[PDB]
Design a protein around this ligand. Structure first.
Ligand code: ALF
Length: 71
DNA sequence: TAGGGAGTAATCCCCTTGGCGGTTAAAACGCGGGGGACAGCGCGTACGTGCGTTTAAGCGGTGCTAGAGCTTGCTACGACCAATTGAGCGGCCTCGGCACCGGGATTCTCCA
């Protein structure tokens, strides 16, 4: 039941990672420096709202600061 | 020895292209007929050809002097730059010019 944050230094890898995560059955969401600011609010609030999501795919720099991911 | 350039990838703002939907106005399609394209014809006059005349353009020659083209000397003036500011650009505001509409009046066409 360990909801989990994955940090990447490369954007192409977090693409490949969700190809793997969609080959498996893992429910995931994504935040990186290309996501637009309202999309960032929504994904952060989505992951922090509903326990259904398993993996937060998460960029090191854009996702590394300021936000709360305490769930 | 160190500073700043080379490499690279993430981050995030700007902006041009493309699609969806409607809807609506302009392009496409039809067809009658008219009148303008155009061929065919007559004349006449106006332009090309030819011949004799003249006129003056072009070539060979002489003489002159203006002025283009070059050298010299110097100082005036525009390039140059450091210090100063105010003219002119970028952003923001608003109101009045002008357009667009509607309906009543005058003009222009075309057929009788
Ligand atoms: F210091 Al933080 F999010 F960790 F502002």
């Amino acid at each position: 039941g360990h909801r989990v944050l994955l940090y990447f230094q490369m954007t192409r890898m977090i693409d490949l990672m969700e190809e793997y995560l969609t080959y498996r059955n893992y429910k995931y969401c994504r935040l990186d420096g290309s996501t637009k600011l309202e999309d960032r609010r929504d994904t952060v609030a989505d992951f922090q709202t509903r326990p259904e999501i398993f993996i937060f795919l998460l960029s090191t720099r854009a996702g590394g600061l300021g936000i709360n991911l305490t769930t």
